[PDB]
Amino acid sequence: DIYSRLLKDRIIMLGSQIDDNVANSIVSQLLFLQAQDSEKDIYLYINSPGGSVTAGFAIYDTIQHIKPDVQTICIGMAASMGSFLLAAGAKGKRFALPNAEVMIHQPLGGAQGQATEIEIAANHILKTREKLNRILSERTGQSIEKIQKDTDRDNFLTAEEAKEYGLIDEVMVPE
Amino acid sequence: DIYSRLLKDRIIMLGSQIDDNVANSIVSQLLFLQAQDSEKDIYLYINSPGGSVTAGFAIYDTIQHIKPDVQTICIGMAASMGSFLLAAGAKGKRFALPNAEVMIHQPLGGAQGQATEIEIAANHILKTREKLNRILSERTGQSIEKIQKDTDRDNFLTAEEAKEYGLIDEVMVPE
Amino acid sequence: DIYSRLLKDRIIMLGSQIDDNVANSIVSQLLFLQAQDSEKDIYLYINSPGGSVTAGFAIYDTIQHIKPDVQTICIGMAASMGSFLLAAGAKGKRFALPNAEVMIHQPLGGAQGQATEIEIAANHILKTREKLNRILSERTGQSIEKIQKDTDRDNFLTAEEAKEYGLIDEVMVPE
Amino acid sequence: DIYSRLLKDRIIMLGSQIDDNVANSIVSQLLFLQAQDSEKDIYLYINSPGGSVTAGFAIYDTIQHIKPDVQTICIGMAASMGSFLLAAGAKGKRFALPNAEVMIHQPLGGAQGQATEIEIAANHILKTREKLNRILSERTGQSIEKIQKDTDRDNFLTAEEAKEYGLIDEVMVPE
Amino acid sequence: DIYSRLLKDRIIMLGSQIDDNVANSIVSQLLFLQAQDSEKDIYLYINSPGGSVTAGFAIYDTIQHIKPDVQTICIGMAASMGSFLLAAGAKGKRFALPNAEVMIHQPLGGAQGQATEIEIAANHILKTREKLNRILSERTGQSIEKIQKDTDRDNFLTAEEAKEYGLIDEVMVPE
Amino acid sequence: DIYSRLLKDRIIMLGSQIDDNVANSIVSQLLFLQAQDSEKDIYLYINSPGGSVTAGFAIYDTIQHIKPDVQTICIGMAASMGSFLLAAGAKGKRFALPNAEVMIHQPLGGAQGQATEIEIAANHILKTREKLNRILSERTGQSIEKIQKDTDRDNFLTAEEAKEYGLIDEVMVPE
Amino acid sequence: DIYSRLLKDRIIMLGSQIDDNVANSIVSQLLFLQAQDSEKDIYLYINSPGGSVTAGFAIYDTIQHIKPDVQTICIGMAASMGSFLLAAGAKGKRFALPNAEVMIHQPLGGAQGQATEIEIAANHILKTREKLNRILSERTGQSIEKIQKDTDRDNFLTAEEAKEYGLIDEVMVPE
Amino acid sequence: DIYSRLLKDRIIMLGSQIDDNVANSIVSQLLFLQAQDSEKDIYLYINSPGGSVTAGFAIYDTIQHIKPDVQTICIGMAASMGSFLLAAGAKGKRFALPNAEVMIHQPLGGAQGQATEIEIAANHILKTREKLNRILSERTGQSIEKIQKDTDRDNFLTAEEAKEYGLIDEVMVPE
Amino acid sequence: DIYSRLLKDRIIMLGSQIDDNVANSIVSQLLFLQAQDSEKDIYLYINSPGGSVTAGFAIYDTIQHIKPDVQTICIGMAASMGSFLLAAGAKGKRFALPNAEVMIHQPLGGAQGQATEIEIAANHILKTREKLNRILSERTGQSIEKIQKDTDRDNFLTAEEAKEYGLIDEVMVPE
Amino acid sequence: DIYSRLLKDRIIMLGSQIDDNVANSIVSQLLFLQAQDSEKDIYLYINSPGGSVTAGFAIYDTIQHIKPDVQTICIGMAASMGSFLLAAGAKGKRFALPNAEVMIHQPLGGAQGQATEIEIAANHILKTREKLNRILSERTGQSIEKIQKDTDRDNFLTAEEAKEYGLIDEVMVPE
Numbered sequence A, B, C, D, E, F, G, H, I, J: 001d002i003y004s005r006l007l008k009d010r011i012i013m014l015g016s017q018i019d020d021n022v023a024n025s026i027v028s029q030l031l032f033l034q035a036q037d038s039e040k041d042i043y044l045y046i047n048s049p050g051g052s053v054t055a056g057f058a059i060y061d062t063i064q065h066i067k068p069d070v071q072t073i074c075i076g077m078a079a080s081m082g083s084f085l086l087a088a089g090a091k092g093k094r095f096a097l098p099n100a101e102v103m104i105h106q107p108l109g110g111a112q113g114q115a116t117e118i119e120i121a122a123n124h125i126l127k128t129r130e131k132l133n134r135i136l137s138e139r140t141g142q143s144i145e146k147i148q149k150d151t152d153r154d155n156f157l158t159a160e161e162a163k164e165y166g167l168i169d170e171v172m173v174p175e
């Protein structure tokens, strides 16, 4: 299988929606790569429309925890939790290809039941948003109040705009 | 039709779920009965599992607004917005048959979408619960804190317990 | 319509499963009949497999509340809440045809959700069973503990067994 | 409507599956006809594939109970509970048109649940079959054990065979 | 039918979602009422969650065009196009009952297909929003800029808040 | 019924999608109104999203073919065949309410099967478009070239724009 | 397989809902790892929304039974039965990554059928909640009264709050 | 695969509902293990909600027939036929983990068709229940009369209660 | 597998709809091929109906971003994003077989929700179309306005027409 | 796998409907076979009901473009695009088994949407039919005018008739 080959070059492809299955695969790949060698870089290609917040945080925390630097490279599109993980790469080693698109927006969810259950769910998603904003602020240098306003609705960015936003460090030019 | 002849005796049957169709029928019947005679009493029989809050308030406010006293008679069951409307009858003229059951609980709803929209919906239903608690406190004489605690979960009441609670004035004995 | 003609003779047909629609129709027919004449007997024919408890209690309490005697006549079958309403007729005026079947059993229901919600639902249905047992004991003369054992599972009775049970007073012979 | 003009000639058409709705319609038509005149004959045309045992007994017991003779005339087909009601007409006044088919067979049913519940359901339907076999033996002049043997499976009979069997008295010839 | 005799009191009930069927019914009632008498007032009760913009404008333009004053009375809820029609009543004669809910928000829609067809749909709905904002500014005295910001998301208003906003003129007290 | 009342005033409401049922109803109403009086005007109110071309042409040809002038009044919306019929009213007597919308676009259809079957269906719809374009050109005073270009995609028009275009003669102002 | 290589390092990934299939896989992995070496530690990564109580106890009891210490590491989320198993790791060796979320709440279930069946199911789930509360009390040091109040509704905890609660021993810092 | 290496340690995992597929897998594992060695023990782990009686007896009879002792160890849950197989292990060698649950109840089934087919099915399931009771009485030392009463409804047992009942010999402690 | 033997000749088959899975496979194969040899040509056979813009740009940017020349050979059909990638091959090395079809058209999409959300989606797809038009203008030597007009609707091109258009350099002759 | 073994003898079996997956498999097998040896003959067995035109042309153009002669052998049936590929084998090496059936007919498709879109699709399928007719004229020696008339509807041919027609060169006799 072709991805088996790429893993020998320490390359991980995140090329789908992020659910728990995908997150456990990515996490296990990071841990496996760290075991083989704990100082050579890892390369995480990202072509993802987003997905679950907790699954995304499973990958995020693993990236920060392991010893090797994790380079992130957006090809095609990094939207929602995909752009959050793009910004999570080793600073100075976060890239996008020239025609890649990046999109940021606020979390989405749902809640049903009694008034108290809806209040619990609303409080949980607002806390989850404040937590995502605070971390994105630390990864980009944007202020939390600006993240909050810029993610009120869907916010599409070119690769160059993503760099000026601080989500990546360089647009990768050919070749 | 049987209900049309009962209407000539100024009797209205609320015997179903409360949605907008039912609420409009009940409201129009109260209006029509007030026009025919504005001082003879009206009798509202209630056998209802509850329904929409705004459809319920359409009936509640029409009862409060018109001239005639509206007697409320719970037969079978008055649950949720049903029991709220039972408590809304003219004071001294709120009844339940001996084996009727009354149930009270907090509102239920749902919300989907972005975090800010879920927060808007959560705030709306909590505000709605506060409004219902306040009115029920006025109709029963119980405190708002007691209502709030007693409606945290489904709360089933006998006709006698509903009288002790202040939801009704008397249990109707034969004949 | 044929049932309209029978209502002229103060005859009500209960020939279906008992839900809120059926109960409100039956209740309105009883009240309409009492208005026309409050001393002439009413005849309630019962061919019913049962239905909702609260809908059944809407009919029960109305029968006990109005002035006229309500005679009950089982044709075909009175099961579950149907036999409960059969036993509710004016004492001495509860009948069944010779090949009618009567069936008694304990209530059924369902509950889903949190442990506390299931606890609340279980407590409500056990309270509802104790109430049904107590009233059936008063209508039949059977002890509450015998009702409890006899309704543990489905209990089919001939018309003659139903009379010796106290659910009816006489088996109607031709003509 | 055509059937109500026929009711003025004391003609009742049973022309469908026998459920509770149909049984209550037929029963009410018999009582109504007896009320208008309690001596003049009633004519019950039967074209039915059968139906519910209890619904059929509602019609059967009403036929035996009223004062007027009830003639039964099979047109097209009287199967299962249909043929039971065909045999139920006033003796000497049970007919079939020359090309009508009569079918008899044993009761069918179903049972789901615990072993004790399946035993209760089996006993009930076996008792039901014995009661039907006994009545048909009285109405036809055949032995119970012959009825049992001849209904073990679907048993189709011509009009002439139904007369030979005792289910009807005469085959109706033109004119 | 109850709504028929209410119409003789010049009362119209808008108690459902607004589609073309409902709109054509309301419009024909307004025309019919003007034909019988063209100076006596008309009373339009509103309990509606909203609906189609063009259906709503059929009712709006008819209200403005006919000669009689059209009073608007919100019972239960006036949301979206329902609250737009509430504010369309004759000034000084727009009411809400004390527990009625009013909600305002921006239009919603959908678009599918080629880029140029999506552009056509976006331009059409933004033009529609500008037209709604401008009319609501005229009916309420609020500025278009405030309407735009206040309708960005769902905005729930009590009867008292709707009066302060200018959507209604008075909250209707008993009796 | 309310529409029967309006038809005595020679008012016809076209308030739905135009299919064959609707067309036959409108056509029969026009024929019936012409028979009652062949000189007094007829008023066709239009709130329609369009529909079938042949159903539309049934109404169109009938309007052209009856002696009385047929006034057309767009309320809410006249799109597609709806706006074609709006433009078909007696010149000088075509109206729209101030907030009515008008939309024009080319016909739509489908074709499946062999190549020669698809070619036949393509030629039939192109000939249909050319006929519709020519007739609309004559009703509006526009060139066929301009109609063709302006209906290539969905084209939304305000009431004032529709008057400028020649689809209506006057915007109806209040009173 | 990537999970196969991690099993070489005595790492087990519980990254899904807990049903019987998953529980048997986790149990067999623990058994297999103990047989290979009964004194080297085992590492249980948890990213789970929870699941079946009995499947959870199959894993819990196997963890307690075997010789090796079992470290638990919450990545992403440990909700419900997932957080119960997180607290079950060897004391001193229960961890969570800094942005992992932990949630605790009371059990859920369902019951259908006769009143006595519903009572049996209610008693079972309440007994199951008492058992879980008691064990969690032992694992965290919190009182059973506190657990019972804190799990009445969904209760979301940060990694730091989970440490304060006693569900984990340390938050894992990089690197 | 993990279960293969466990089979080398003579471990069999019964961790699912028991149907014919599972039974044939378990049976072939028992025979395969006997062929390799006919005197060393076999270990059957049981986490099962139950299943088919005949599939269960395929496993039961195979366990009794082969030479090696089969230890049974309930993890998580042994319900219905699962608890029957738990009690089927070699006496002295039947265990449950401390938080395992055990449930016993009477068989369930269904029957549809003619009265004689229902009677056949009823007799077959009653015979099956007598056979299960007699074997369980032998495995546990309890009387058949007590088994019959204790299995009338669902009967949940802790590991300790199962030992007292005789279903297991010991609750296995760590480690 | 046949495609892996072709990969050793540096042949990549793009023979399906272009989604993220396909894009990541193609990207992985380009990277892998560049790693084995960074100067020898790569051959990308294209038989595709098109697909996702972002997935297509993942392949496009990878093609421009590797050192080796990528020849593109259209077999069967290159439509939509398929034809975009066909034009993306190394200039002078873009081919089509004599009977391959090439189709170009403008992007398609959808948008649902509030007016502001629809405007965001419309602007994003219009910007996407502009970006695609500019690149195709550079790759084909046609003007932006000609690309815009020629893609307003589906535009089918033979292999020879595709060469005249600049989408390919040569039509590949036999053999 | 059996088809792998036959590829050793340079045998490719086209035995299914022709879509893009199948076409890419066949194309890749031809290229792979040409790589191993570019002068040994290839044998393509055809048993196909047809399929996509563009997928068929992918196979056709590859057959003409490789160096080796491709023999075509129809077994069972070559219908529609299947017979087109049969006629495409190296002249003198196109065969059919004596009972194989051959069928030719004109292309089929479908179109939906605006009139201009149906015209585009009609023109495209007509152009495709003309290209198919011209190539088959060249492969068979029949005139385009004869192909056009013979493919108006389904035209079934025996192996012998296919030889007379020019679709094949010889009917294969045993052995």
Ligand SMILES: CC(C)C[C@@H](NC(=O)[C@H](Cc1ccccc1)NC(=O)c1cnccn1)B(O)O
Pocket (backbone or CB within 6 Å): A049, A050, A051, A052, A053, A054, A079, A080, A081, A082, A084, A105, A106, A107, A108, A109, A110, A124, A125, A128, A132
């Ligand atoms: C940066 C952030 C915007 C990324 C993703 N956003 C989300 O909102 C996801 C959407 C979702 C996915 C599957 C199932 C339901 C919901 N929401 C949650 O995981 C969540 C978290 N905490 C509480 C409630 N929900 B993105 O891909 O859009």
Ligand SMILES: CC(C)C[C@@H](NC(=O)[C@H](Cc1ccccc1)NC(=O)c1cnccn1)B(O)O
Pocket (backbone or CB within 6 Å): B049, B050, B051, B052, B053, B054, B079, B080, B081, B082, B084, B105, B106, B107, B108, B109, B110, B124, B125, B128, B132
């Ligand atoms: C508690 C009692 C006094 C009244 C009723 N309780 C409710 O929860 C209803 C239930 C509902 C069901 C289906 C669809 C919608 C609503 N909730 C609302 O109307 C509502 C209002 N505002 C915000 C959110 N929800 B009862 O009678 O059922």
Ligand SMILES: CC(C)C[C@@H](NC(=O)[C@H](Cc1ccccc1)NC(=O)c1cnccn1)B(O)O
Pocket (backbone or CB within 6 Å): C049, C050, C051, C052, C053, C054, C079, C080, C081, C082, C084, C105, C106, C107, C108, C109, C110, C124, C125, C128, C132
């Ligand atoms: C004498 C009595 C045995 C009669 C009826 N028995 C019942 O169990 C009904 C059945 C039912 C039917 C449809 C949907 C749900 C339940 N149960 C309730 O109404 C109920 C349940 N829980 C709490 C309060 N009430 B019988 O006639 O079916």
Ligand SMILES: CC(C)C[C@@H](NC(=O)[C@H](Cc1ccccc1)NC(=O)c1cnccn1)B(O)O
Pocket (backbone or CB within 6 Å): D049, D050, D051, D052, D053, D054, D079, D080, D081, D082, D084, D105, D106, D107, D108, D109, D110, D124, D125, D128, D132
């Ligand atoms: C003389 C007699 C043979 C006539 C009818 N026979 C039946 O079996 C009916 C069929 C049926 C229809 C609807 C729903 C269930 C069953 N059975 C019962 O009504 C029944 C069953 N079990 C216990 C009590 N009653 B016939 O018309 O076929």
Ligand SMILES: CC(C)C[C@@H](NC(=O)[C@H](Cc1ccccc1)NC(=O)c1cnccn1)B(O)O
Pocket (backbone or CB within 6 Å): E049, E050, E051, E052, E053, E054, E079, E080, E081, E082, E084, E105, E106, E107, E108, E109, E110, E124, E125, E128, E132
């Ligand atoms: C702001 C408030 C006055 C709006 C009310 N209606 C809407 O937003 C509707 C929603 C809808 C209803 C039926 C069918 C489709 C869509 N949208 C349109 O009608 C529409 C959309 N795009 C262009 C033009 N019009 B309210 O009830 O929400």
Ligand SMILES: CC(C)C[C@@H](NC(=O)[C@H](Cc1ccccc1)NC(=O)c1cnccn1)B(O)O
Pocket (backbone or CB within 6 Å): F049, F050, F051, F052, F053, F054, F079, F080, F081, F082, F084, F105, F106, F107, F108, F109, F110, F124, F125, F128, F132
């Ligand atoms: C353009 C405008 C003046 C009128 C309407 N346009 C249409 O295309 C309708 C839509 C349709 C309805 C039912 C079934 C299929 C299609 N098309 C036809 O009736 C038709 C199509 N092909 C040949 C002949 N007739 B409008 O409402 O959009």
Ligand SMILES: CC(C)C[C@@H](NC(=O)[C@H](Cc1ccccc1)NC(=O)c1cnccn1)B(O)O
Pocket (backbone or CB within 6 Å): G049, G050, G051, G052, G053, G054, G079, G080, G081, G082, G084, G105, G106, G107, G108, G109, G110, G124, G125, G128, G132
């Ligand atoms: C850890 C605990 C606080 C909640 C966890 N599980 C539950 O509540 C489950 C929900 C469920 C899932 C699948 C199938 C059935 C039920 N309930 C039961 O297993 C159960 C046990 N005994 C009696 C009744 N129910 B958690 O992970 O949600």
Ligand SMILES: CC(C)C[C@@H](NC(=O)[C@H](Cc1ccccc1)NC(=O)c1cnccn1)B(O)O
Pocket (backbone or CB within 6 Å): H049, H050, H051, H052, H053, H054, H079, H080, H081, H082, H084, H105, H106, H107, H108, H109, H110, H124, H125, H128, H132
């Ligand atoms: C007491 C306890 C040991 C019962 C176990 N099984 C059953 O009761 C099953 C339920 C069932 C399962 C699959 C298909 C159909 C029915 N019933 C039968 O197998 C059966 C056999 N013969 C006659 C009638 N029924 B337990 O494990 O659930």
Ligand SMILES: CC(C)C[C@@H](NC(=O)[C@H](Cc1ccccc1)NC(=O)c1cnccn1)B(O)O
Pocket (backbone or CB within 6 Å): I049, I050, I051, I052, I053, I054, I079, I080, I081, I082, I084, I104, I105, I106, I107, I108, I109, I124, I125, I128, I132
């Ligand atoms: C490049 C041009 C020749 C058209 C090609 N692709 C498209 O139009 C796709 C269609 C699609 C289908 C399913 C899911 C998503 C998109 N549209 C987009 O990707 C898109 C989405 N949002 C904004 C901008 N673009 B071609 O292959 O049809």
Ligand SMILES: CC(C)C[C@@H](NC(=O)[C@H](Cc1ccccc1)NC(=O)c1cnccn1)B(O)O
Pocket (backbone or CB within 6 Å): J049, J050, J051, J052, J053, J054, J079, J080, J081, J082, J084, J105, J106, J107, J108, J109, J124, J125, J128, J132
């Ligand atoms: C040999 C030839 C005369 C007929 C063969 N195929 C066709 O006619 C297919 C039918 C079809 C199959 C799959 C999907 C869509 C349509 N049509 C096209 O491929 C097509 C052509 N031109 C424009 C658009 N589509 B045969 O095998 O039937």
